Scaffold this active site. Structure first.
Site, PDB file in Angstrom:
ATOM      1  N   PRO A 114      28.969  48.312  53.184  1.00 12.70           N
ATOM      2  CA  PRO A 114      29.879  48.982  54.109  1.00 12.70           C
ATOM      3  C   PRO A 114      30.474  50.232  53.454  1.00 12.70           C
ATOM      4  O   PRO A 114      30.729  50.192  52.277  1.00 12.70           O
ATOM      5  CB  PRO A 114      31.013  47.982  54.363  1.00 12.70           C
ATOM      6  CG  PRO A 114      30.553  46.695  53.725  1.00 12.70           C
ATOM      7  CD  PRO A 114      29.554  47.081  52.653  1.00 12.70           C
ATOM      8  N   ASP A 157      31.893  52.413  58.605  1.00 10.93           N
ATOM      9  CA  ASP A 157      32.926  51.844  59.504  1.00 10.93           C
ATOM     10  C   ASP A 157      33.683  53.012  60.142  1.00 10.93           C
ATOM     11  O   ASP A 157      34.930  53.049  60.051  1.00 10.93           O
ATOM     12  CB  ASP A 157      33.823  50.861  58.743  1.00 10.93           C
ATOM     13  CG  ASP A 157      34.431  49.775  59.618  1.00 10.93           C
ATOM     14  OD1 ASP A 157      34.170  49.780  60.841  1.00 10.93           O
ATOM     15  OD2 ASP A 157      35.164  48.927  59.069  1.00 10.93           O
ATOM     16  N   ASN A 174      36.401  52.101  63.817  1.00  9.25           N
ATOM     17  CA  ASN A 174      36.801  51.488  62.525  1.00  9.25           C
ATOM     18  C   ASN A 174      37.294  50.063  62.796  1.00  9.25           C
ATOM     19  O   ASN A 174      38.328  49.920  63.467  1.00  9.25           O
ATOM     20  CB  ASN A 174      37.874  52.292  61.787  1.00  9.25           C
ATOM     21  CG  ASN A 174      38.213  51.705  60.431  1.00  9.25           C
ATOM     22  OD1 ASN A 174      37.373  51.093  59.773  1.00  9.25           O
ATOM     23  ND2 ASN A 174      39.444  51.891  59.996  1.00  9.25           N
ATOM     24  N   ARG A 207      29.579  44.108  57.370  1.00  3.40           N
ATOM     25  CA  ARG A 207      28.728  43.144  56.625  1.00  3.40           C
ATOM     26  C   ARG A 207      27.930  42.295  57.615  1.00  3.40           C
ATOM     27  O   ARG A 207      26.755  42.023  57.334  1.00  3.40           O
ATOM     28  CB  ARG A 207      29.573  42.271  55.707  1.00  3.40           C
ATOM     29  CG  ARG A 207      30.027  42.985  54.449  1.00  3.40           C
ATOM     30  CD  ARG A 207      31.059  42.144  53.745  1.00  3.40           C
ATOM     31  NE  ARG A 207      31.321  42.671  52.414  1.00  3.40           N
ATOM     32  CZ  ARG A 207      32.411  42.384  51.705  1.00  3.40           C
ATOM     33  NH1 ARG A 207      33.351  41.607  52.218  1.00  3.40           N
ATOM     34  NH2 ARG A 207      32.555  42.885  50.492  1.00  3.40           N
ATOM     35  N   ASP A 262      30.091  46.701  47.224  1.00  6.22           N
ATOM     36  CA  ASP A 262      31.245  47.537  47.645  1.00  6.22           C
ATOM     37  C   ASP A 262      30.902  48.994  47.346  1.00  6.22           C
ATOM     38  O   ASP A 262      30.244  49.253  46.339  1.00  6.22           O
ATOM     39  CB  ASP A 262      32.552  47.094  46.994  1.00  6.22           C
ATOM     40  CG  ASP A 262      33.038  45.754  47.521  1.00  6.22           C
ATOM     41  OD1 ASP A 262      32.548  45.320  48.591  1.00  6.22           O
ATOM     42  OD2 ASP A 262      33.899  45.141  46.858  1.00  6.22           O
ATOM     43  N   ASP A 317      35.893  37.208  52.389  1.00  7.23           N
ATOM     44  CA  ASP A 317      34.776  37.074  51.423  1.00  7.23           C
ATOM     45  C   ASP A 317      34.809  35.673  50.798  1.00  7.23           C
ATOM     46  O   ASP A 317      33.731  35.056  50.657  1.00  7.23           O
ATOM     47  CB  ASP A 317      34.822  38.197  50.384  1.00  7.23           C
ATOM     48  CG  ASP A 317      36.104  38.230  49.576  1.00  7.23           C
ATOM     49  OD1 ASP A 317      37.133  37.816  50.115  1.00  7.23           O
ATOM     50  OD2 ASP A 317      36.061  38.684  48.420  1.00  7.23           O
TER      51      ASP A 317
HETATM   52  O1  LIG Z   1      43.785  25.424  35.862  1.00 10.31           O
HETATM   53  P1  LIG Z   1      42.324  25.399  35.625  1.00 10.31           P
HETATM   54  O2  LIG Z   1      41.917  24.331  34.460  1.00 10.31           O
HETATM   55  O3  LIG Z   1      41.486  24.913  36.920  1.00 10.31           O
HETATM   56  O4  LIG Z   1      41.678  26.810  35.191  1.00 10.31           O
HETATM   57  C1  LIG Z   1      42.472  27.964  35.014  1.00 10.31           C
HETATM   58  C2  LIG Z   1      41.844  28.837  33.937  1.00 10.31           C
HETATM   59  O5  LIG Z   1      42.792  29.828  33.526  1.00 10.31           O
HETATM   60  C3  LIG Z   1      40.568  29.497  34.477  1.00 10.31           C
HETATM   61  O6  LIG Z   1      39.619  29.583  33.409  1.00 10.31           O
HETATM   62  C4  LIG Z   1      40.866  30.907  35.020  1.00 10.31           C
HETATM   63  O7  LIG Z   1      41.747  30.845  36.155  1.00 10.31           O
HETATM   64  C5  LIG Z   1      39.560  31.548  35.410  1.00 10.31           C
HETATM   65  O8  LIG Z   1      39.913  32.861  35.842  1.00 10.31           O
HETATM   66  P2  LIG Z   1      39.047  34.143  35.336  1.00 10.31           P
HETATM   67  O9  LIG Z   1      39.508  34.663  34.037  1.00 10.31           O
HETATM   68  O10 LIG Z   1      37.512  33.600  35.236  1.00 10.31           O
HETATM   69  O11 LIG Z   1      39.205  35.223  36.538  1.00 10.31           O
HETATM   70  C6  LIG Z   1      40.501  35.494  37.064  1.00 10.31           C
HETATM   71  C7  LIG Z   1      40.467  35.450  38.597  1.00 10.31           C
HETATM   72  O12 LIG Z   1      39.491  34.483  39.051  1.00 10.31           O
HETATM   73  C8  LIG Z   1      40.154  36.859  39.149  1.00 10.31           C
HETATM   74  O13 LIG Z   1      41.039  37.822  38.564  1.00 10.31           O
HETATM   75  C9  LIG Z   1      40.297  36.922  40.687  1.00 10.31           C
HETATM   76  O14 LIG Z   1      40.895  35.719  41.188  1.00 10.31           O
HETATM   77  C10 LIG Z   1      38.916  37.131  41.284  1.00 10.31           C
HETATM   78  O15 LIG Z   1      39.006  36.776  42.671  1.00 10.31           O
HETATM   79  P3  LIG Z   1      37.650  36.570  43.541  1.00 10.31           P
HETATM   80  O16 LIG Z   1      37.264  35.022  43.329  1.00 10.31           O
HETATM   81  O17 LIG Z   1      36.585  37.480  43.066  1.00 10.31           O
HETATM   82  O18 LIG Z   1      38.108  36.738  45.104  1.00 10.31           O
HETATM   83  C11 LIG Z   1      37.643  37.814  45.890  1.00 10.31           C
HETATM   84  C12 LIG Z   1      38.757  38.853  46.048  1.00 10.31           C
HETATM   85  O19 LIG Z   1      38.166  40.149  46.157  1.00 10.31           O
HETATM   86  C13 LIG Z   1      39.624  38.623  47.317  1.00 10.31           C
HETATM   87  O20 LIG Z   1      39.177  37.504  48.096  1.00 10.31           O
HETATM   88  C14 LIG Z   1      41.098  38.466  46.881  1.00 10.31           C
HETATM   89  O21 LIG Z   1      41.643  39.783  46.759  1.00 10.31           O
HETATM   90  C15 LIG Z   1      41.898  37.549  47.818  1.00 10.31           C
HETATM   91  O22 LIG Z   1      43.258  38.027  47.945  1.00 10.31           O
END
Ligand SMILES: O=P(O)(O)OC[C@H](O)[C@H](O)[C@H](O)COP(=O)(O)OC[C@H](O)[C@H](O)[C@H](O)COP(=O)(O)OC[C@@H](O)[C@@H](O)[C@@H](O)CO
Ligand SMILES: O=P(O)(O)OC[C@H](O)[C@H](O)[C@H](O)COP(=O)(O)OC[C@H](O)[C@H](O)[C@H](O)COP(=O)(O)OC[C@@H](O)[C@@H](O)[C@@H](O)CO
Ligand SMILES: O=P(O)(O)OC[C@H](O)[C@H](O)[C@H](O)COP(=O)(O)OC[C@H](O)[C@H](O)[C@H](O)COP(=O)(O)OC[C@@H](O)[C@@H](O)[C@@H](O)CO
Ligand SMILES: [Cl-]
Ligand SMILES: [Cl-]
Ligand SMILES: [Cl-]
Ligand SMILES: [Cl-]
Ligand SMILES: [Cl-]
Ligand SMILES: [Cl-]
Ligand SMILES: [Mg+2]
Lengths: 318, 317, 312
Positions: free
Chosen positions: C9, C41, C68, C76, C92, C179
């Site tokens: 998009p 869009d 838009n 998508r 993206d 997403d």
């Molecule tokens: O408490 P537990 O044992 O289950 O685990 C917690 C640990 O600390 C764990 O290893 C970490 O949370 C893993 O996090 P990370 O370091 O692999 O990544 C951090 C976040 O997952 C990341 O910064 C974002 O949350 C990524 O989000 P997306 O899953 O890619 O969501 C899509 C996003 O564009 C969108 O949907 C959001 O903007 C929704 O508002």
């Protein structure tokens, strides 16, 4: 013909200590014909000891004896206000001292800056009553600001007030509460005047140290918020929110029974106290809350919700 | 009439019981001045426990219950009925008496006209803890419940004057599996004045080796009832002080004290807190000012029956 | 039939779009084995974005939406209807593909019969998931053991047959978390997930009524999963999602924020209503530091959420 300053001093069972106070007023650098000391005895019953001290200064002071003890300084101070036709009044507590240059320096500073209010730096003798400090930390201020100069942290009436502001706005001490009536008076005065001055050259005023439901106290706090939100000087609603929020901060930092929630107070009294606090704060717009210092965000919301457990927790986290 | 009756319930103790029985038979006190009463709660360990007890036939009094009662209350009550001694001393089947325990405690009791004598506890191994603060002032001839931390030593592993038990008809209850010993000691304390603490030796050694709250809180309710009906502590303000001290002990050492933040199912937490709340709300709020102030929030949370507030209170403790 | 359809998009991207389109056209994969589908869009940037796309006429498929839509969901979905490829890869408009992204991910997917292939993310400027990539390549990944609920973007290679058979579309309930819902619906309707970490294959270049309606759909997708049918397994997945929501959700620290009181109440009300449709059996799978905050939300108690946040 018209005096510069009327010093208004309520008395009650002061005894021989009153000599020191009266002497501090009579020994001023200001011309003795330019000011007066008005003494209003709240029906002392100390076997004439207090009256005997006052009788030694007959003809050097104006004196009135109330027929009955009013119980607080409000009635005596109102009596003093009716008796004064001076340019300024200065309220003095019966156990306190004036610096020899207090009336002259404060009056001169006030006259030079067209001040409605002049605040002289406070000193203290002994442990007990504390005195404001932050208001005096910037030295002399000719045109002070309530918020920038911490005036909501110095709301005693131990100050020089322009009498015309009191007369035009019919400002009197209220008698519905034993506490915070001086705060209400200063707030009513501040909300009806613009020109405030702070003088710090000397300790001009020396404070000498030697089961409420809250119905009356919170009625007084309610009047303070009313005075802010009805101010003909501070007319802008957002400015009122800021002033109200600053008062809320002062109330949570220094209010009566500020730590009631975790205290040994009977549960039923805690509920009645929090109910009065909650009722009063819920008449204050939530728009003021963003001006409250953020550490108090939980405590303030707990009081709005009338939730004793949440106030107890808030206090444990502060 | 004997000076002391030692009352010992048994259940599936096996060969370990030798050490305990021997500790009672090896006392500095004249052997004709005391007796060991053993009440077996119908042991089913292929006769191992009965075989150990049979080796002391003629040297101990013995009674076998027809059915396992499940707790020490029924056996201890049986022992009380069997004793005509001046004092009784309750002993757990895995524990040891110091050789000078009966003589020193009895002599101290007789010299101070004591209704209750508490000997310093020792402990072997991790598990059951023992009180310490009660013994930190040395020997005390006329002890005070509050000043000598007696609500922190409510086990029945003590020397009790039998006349107080008989006159006031004090029996162990069977309402719950837990805190029945506490209730007994509280009932005794509330019906007597003279308490003594002896600390010269570890006189009693605790030996370690290895749900809804309806019944438990019924027992806690009886403890508060005993305090507020005390014919010794008649002053209402003194009752509030005692009740507040018990509340402190309950919050410091009670069963499942940390239930709120535990892995307990939500519905069980609510039922547990509901029983706790119902019980504490029968206790005058006048007692609350005598509770140690760190517990002010947790106590109020329980009175309000508010699980979130108890969870928060525990996080702040 | 193409191996991969890259679906991108666009909206008012301007000259930056060159770098992105170039990254897709410069792949190690045979150029006839994939396509780039661009769905604008209705850009209104004085034709700047359309002018950049017009420079690749004949090398890309292009569709311009009449209005838009406001969110990437409609574009998508348009891309999905236009693709007849074996796999789709969502990109993206400001992001870059490594030159070996399509080839390496497709080959790994084909070799492991993968429904989903996740390439390691890199980032340019001031976040991306990390824990999912910490075990190197994983041919048969597990949602819980490989932290897949912490990498729910659609910036991945999805098998088209799973999307078509289960009629998986991006929803338009909300501007956010659509997403996540798509990836969750896909995960709950497939078994074979692969993680490739040889390169930074993808470089990210830097109402609560609607949001919680989307969160509600995520829980619904877990509890209706035809792959994860065991109720206890659903509780575990739901509890893991709850943990991720409390760690990384929108406005996670709303309670002590500068949000107006009335908006805090409305937000918590929606959060509470949504979480109270989730079985309490899932709560034991939530990381225990969040025990108080979670219970505060279930009780719909703003003060308790404020306190929970102060203790975290
Ligand atoms: O408490 P537990 O044992 O289950 O685990 C917690 C640990 O600390 C764990 O290893 C970490 O949370 C893993 O996090 P990370 O370091 O692999 O990544 C951090 C976040 O997952 C990341 O910064 C974002 O949350 C990524 O989000 P997306 O899953 O890619 O969501 C899509 C996003 O564009 C969108 O949907 C959001 O903007 C929704 O508002
Ligand atoms: O940045 P914020 O606004 O959150 O913090 C404010 C500053 O940190 C401030 O400087 C501090 O509060 C310290 O202020 P302070 O040391 O200058 O003043 C101390 C108190 O204001 C003062 O000791 C008492 O509050 C006395 O209050 P008064 O306004 O002089 O009169 C009230 C008193 O006569 C009476 O009406 C009441 O005490 C009866 O309840
Ligand atoms: O009272 P405050 O708040 O000013 O402060 C208390 C002091 O800090 C004090 O020094 C200590 O709390 C007192 O504890 P301690 O060091 O003397 O240890 C005594 C403990 O209470 C003890 O470890 C047990 O918790 C008490 O158990 P028992 O009284 O022997 O109860 C009988 C027990 O077998 C049974 O009733 C329970 O297992 C049933 O739940
Ligand atoms: Cl101001
Ligand atoms: Cl009051
Ligand atoms: Cl009003
Ligand atoms: Cl204004
Ligand atoms: Cl105050
Ligand atoms: Cl028991
Ligand atoms: Mg609460």
């Amino acid at each position: 013909s018209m005096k510069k300053v009327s010093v208004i001093m309520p008395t009650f069972n002061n005894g021989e200590k009153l000599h020191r106070t009266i002497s501090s007023v009579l020994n001023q650098t200001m011309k003795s014909t330019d000011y007066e000391l008005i003494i209003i005895d709240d029906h002392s019953n100390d076997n004439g000891e207090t009256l005997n001290v006052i009788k030694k200064y007959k003809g050097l002071v104006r004196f009135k004896q109330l027929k009955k003890n009013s119980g607080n300084a409000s009635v005596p101070r109102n009596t003093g206000l009716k008796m004064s036709k001076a340019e300024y009044v200065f309220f003095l507590d019966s156990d306190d001292l004036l610096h020899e240059r207090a009336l002259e320096d404060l009056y001169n500073y006030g006259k030079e800056n067209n001040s409605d209010l002049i605040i002289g730096k406070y000193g203290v003798e002994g442990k007990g009553r504390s005195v404001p400090k932050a208001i005096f930390e910037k030295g002399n201020v000719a045109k002070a600001d309530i918020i920038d100069n911490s005036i909501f942290y110095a709301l005693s009436v131990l100050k020089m007030f322009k009498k015309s502001v009191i007369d035009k706005n019919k400002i009197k001490f209220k008698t519905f509460s034993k506490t915070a009536e001086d705060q209400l008076f200063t707030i009513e005065f501040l909300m009806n005047s613009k020109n405030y001055s702070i003088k710090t050259d000397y300790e001009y005023y020396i404070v000498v140290n030697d089961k409420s439901t809250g119905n009356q106290y919170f009625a007084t706090i309610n009047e303070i918020y009313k005075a802010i939100y009805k101010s003909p000087i501070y007319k802008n609603q957002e400015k009122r929110h800021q002033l109200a929020g600053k008062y809320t901060t002062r109330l949570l930092r220094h209010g009566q029974k500020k730590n009631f929630a975790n205290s040994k107070m009977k549960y039923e009294d805690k509920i009645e106290w929090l109910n009065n606090f909650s009722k009063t704060i819920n008449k204050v717009p939530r728009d003021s809350d963003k001006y409250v210092t953020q550490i108090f965000n939980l405590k303030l919301e707990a009081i709005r919700q009338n939730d004793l457990l949440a106030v107890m927790i808030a206090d444990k986290l502060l």
